[PDB]
Design a protein around this ligand. Sequence first.
Ligand SMILES: O=C(c1ccc(-n2nnc3cccnc32)cc1)N(c1ncccc1Cl)[C@@H]1CCCNC1
Ligand SMILES: [Mg+2]
Ligand SMILES: [Mg+2]
Lengths: 397, 153, 61, 26, 61
Amino acid sequence: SHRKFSAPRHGSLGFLPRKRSSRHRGKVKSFPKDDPSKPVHLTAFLGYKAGMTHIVREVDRPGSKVNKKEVVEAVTIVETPPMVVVGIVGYVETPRGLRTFKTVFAEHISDECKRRFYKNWHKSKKKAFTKYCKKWQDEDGKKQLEKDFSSMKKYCQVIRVIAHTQMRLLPLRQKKAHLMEIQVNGGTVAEKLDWARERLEQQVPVNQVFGQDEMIDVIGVTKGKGYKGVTSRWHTKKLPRKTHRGLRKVACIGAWHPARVAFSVARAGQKGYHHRTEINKKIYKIGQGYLIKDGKLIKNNASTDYDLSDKSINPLGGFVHYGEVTNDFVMLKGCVVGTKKRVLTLRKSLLVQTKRRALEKIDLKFIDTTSKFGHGRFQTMEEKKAFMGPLKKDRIA
Amino acid sequence: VRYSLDPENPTKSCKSRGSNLRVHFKNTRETAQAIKGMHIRKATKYLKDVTLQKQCVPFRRYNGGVGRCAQAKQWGWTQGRWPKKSAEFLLHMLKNAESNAELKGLDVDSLVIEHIQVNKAPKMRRRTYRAHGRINPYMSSPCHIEMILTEKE
Amino acid sequence: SMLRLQKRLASSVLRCGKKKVWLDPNETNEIANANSRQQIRKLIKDGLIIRKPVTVHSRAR
Amino acid sequence: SWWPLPLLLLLLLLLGPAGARAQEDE
Amino acid sequence: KVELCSFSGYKIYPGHGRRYARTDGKVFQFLNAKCESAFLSKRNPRQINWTVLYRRKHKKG
RNA sequence: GUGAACAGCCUCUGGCAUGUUGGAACAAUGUAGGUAAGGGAAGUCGGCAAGCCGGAUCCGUAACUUCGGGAUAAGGAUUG
RNA sequence: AACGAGAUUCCCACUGUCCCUACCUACUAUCCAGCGAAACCACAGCCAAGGGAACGGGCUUGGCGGAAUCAGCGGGGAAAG
RNA sequence: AAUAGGGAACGUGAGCUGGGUUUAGACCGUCGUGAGACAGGUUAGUUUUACCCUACUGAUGAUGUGUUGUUGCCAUGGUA
Ligand SMILES: O=C(c1ccc(-n2nnc3cccnc32)cc1)N(c1ncccc1Cl)[C@@H]1CCCNC1
Ligand SMILES: [Mg+2]
Ligand SMILES: [Mg+2]
């Protein structure tokens, strides 16, 4: 009775069903609530984390001791090829919640959407949306497909956009696109719907959605750690060495008279692979990746104004366990939920903030692309064989 | 002798019986439920796959402790197991049944396993030696197997 | 084709251990036809049962 | 053959004493 | 600022390595624990082969 | 063979199939064995448990004493 | 004095005993083929309050109540011996 | 910042520890003629079982939608 020594609860009860999430792709539980006074835009975007590096920047912050000095920061980078818009969804508001009014898919649909609509693309006859594409072309279906837009415009009040990723531009194995469903927050619902009729089956890049030194959310599924015990899932204290039948256990799990174990106690089970939202991640740089062949392959990523060197942000030796980033990227200050190669959904924040850490301008000075596959100490292959010199590598001429 | 539920037409029927044979009762009961109503060329091809572990037996009644396999989803169940001894004995007299079928003049492209039951045989004992100077029994639990086959039309 | 007896009888007439005896595994049924020690001595002379010498234990180093 | 033979009487003898001792409060 | 390591003579980029200070006011730079340990193991760079001060004494590339 | 040695470790003569079963996997908790930055008993009824020290050679050894001891005191140096 | 697998207090040295845990290895546990017991058992098995042999699982009044199960777990069965 | 007070079978031993108490050995003091006594002191003293039912924790799945798939909504529960 009355522990003699106060101590707080281990772990949070706000994440209490520590369960394997029912989704691999992170689900936006809440898009930013809009007013129609803003211009028309997207709110969320799919991306794949490649790995981390660090950075050097001249941080401007009056008052602090950090002021006008170089300060390193951990940065993750997220490989984001452009999405491609396929569908328009309409949601009508009810006294029971939102309800999908109807959907309209694009006139002709890609290979990697259609692969997401199967559990065995090999055994399939590859037959999805084959009868649906023939109502865009017949005279009778075409007048009642554009009637489903005019009924969408009349009744439903929030509309969303079904877009998928281009997995062909990615070093992964998967080749199934991830099919997201993202809310447009424009002006009126007629302009909000005409902005998506304009731009079905077309690409939407990542710089069109997000901006530099702007602060977003990251939604994804965490690193899965498996079935772990009390002291690792819940960070409970170990018992002393002298304890019979075990160290890594919680000793008492309840009193007598509530004759029943509580949900509030800690006990062993699945650790990791949980659906989480990190808030207030600042974007450091929007990347542009491996452009036109007039100059044969301008790598040119991670080449700041203070660097002025032909570098590319993929490190020396490649990203470990990921591949090699040939596409656009968004780099974020700090750690981000997920394993490498995991789909994570970037999203503009709901809340507005000033805080003087948001809205500050960041100007880079240096990105290292040194080898993460060991204790690497060089940053380009030009830089190494200048220092290393000739070897027994060529040794024929 | 006399079996359970004699067939409605013993002209187009067949029968087989194995008595007092040392298999587990609980394993042999649940693969006999797996081939009840099954055609003889499919039941053989199923029973070969139980030994090769390409296709399992769903344990429905005697399921305590039985692990969850992926191959029991076909049967509409979660738990399954691959008894190769139990699927060998009722494959051995699945052959004896179709030995009697041509001996009576029946077509083995029409035989279904109509009736197959498994009931218990008298237990035979040996003993183990447990802590603090005690004796407890290892009792074997054999089974009696009888099957009735019938041409389908 | 149990050769356990002739393994034993050959280790007692070659004055050796059970390890040492018998190279050439091809004449299995001939040496299984033996059951006497005089049967097993005619196989010593015919080379089917050899002594297979001592494992080397050099005192060089 | 066939007809085997009988085994042996169990002949159990008691042992342990209320588990690991234990004395009530005085 | 991009410095040099005080044991092996390789080049340390900001973010990497570890800096060490001794009571007599000397401050040293190390880029990994392989260079950090051999300095603390009272050991001279000129004998070990990979370091830069070995490439300067012996006329290497 | 090594070594002060019927120690330990490794082999030859002679034995054996790993001790009443095999396969796949490498989660928790265990049992048994390690290792750990900075601090060094703050843990605990208690330094419990573990870790330090350890062989030999050269020095060098106090209080006390029944003059025998203590004493491999302690404390160093060395070793291919 | 010497000697104690005796009791105790301090100090040095040392260390995961602790801050504060982490990782690796073997043997399991786990899944499979075979073989396979025992303690225990009125009927059984979700709770809150009331009354009651004054601390219900069943009874009263409420809360509520879907098959079949697996790896764990030590609150309860005023658990077993 | 403050080092408030309590409860839950004086919460919590098939969760631990065993210091104390509280068997059997022994010593001392007082008591008794004596055997022995003393919440008087000291020292050394085996701490068993979950594989059952529920509860809790995770893991498949069940009902219903003709089958099956993708994208979703939020009743309710947790909540920092
Ligand atoms: O073996 C036993 C032992 C333990 C329990 C039972 N029990 N308990 N409940 C019982 C009901 C029926 C029968 N037997 C029963 C019997 C014996 N030991 C033991 N342990 C602790 C205290 C006393 C003893 Cl003697 C030894 C001692 C030496 C080290 N190894 C353990
Ligand atoms: Mg919401
Ligand atoms: Mg924490």
